[PDB]
């Protein structure tokens, strides 16, 4: 115990963590407007970031 | 270049600065339907399924764009003195609107004058929009403005028109802006070296 300083849990995204990863990588695709990424995320049940 | 940058219409969000998209929309119609031809206006805004729903919510502006596509020349003069009153009204176009409808007149006038060569004056009054001697002291004014190819004769009641070739007019601003770059250097010329 006297060895690390500091450990850090790095959890599997949420419904809310899923969306600003959709919304941040999703900057530099020529979109169209009106997506509901929302039901997306919903669609995708946690994987990960990647 | 503002209707090539207001090219896509689909990218383009509800924004902060047109609350409404549509309003976006009728900017985008309005400068487009200076900015090109026929060839794209017949492809481009005439088959665009998000243009076409967006104005299917417009009853004037629809039929706006219809009256000049589908010939309908007398009430085009109709809708286009509401188009041009609200523009009148309009901040950022109310520097402008009086250089849009000169603009949109002529326009007018080549699309349906470049038909025939022996088309009549006494034909427009009726199947074009009223006023005999308002059409003698426009059509002039822009003969005399140096646009609008034809050459109307009066005392037989009767217009003609010619084609020109792209050599004289290509030339016309050639002149225009060689002699202002010449002007140009000429200027800076003169203030360097004192």
Redesign the interface.
Known sequence: PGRIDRKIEFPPPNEEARLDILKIHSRKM????GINLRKIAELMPGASGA | QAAELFLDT?????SYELMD?KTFVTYTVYVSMIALERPDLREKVIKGAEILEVLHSLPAVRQYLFSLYECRYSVFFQSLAVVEQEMKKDWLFAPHYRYYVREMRIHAYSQLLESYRSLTLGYMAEAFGVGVEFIDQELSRFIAAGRLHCKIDKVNEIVETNRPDSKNWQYQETIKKGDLLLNRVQKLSRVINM
């Open positions: 020529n979109l169209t407007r | 689909v990218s383009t969000f509800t998209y």
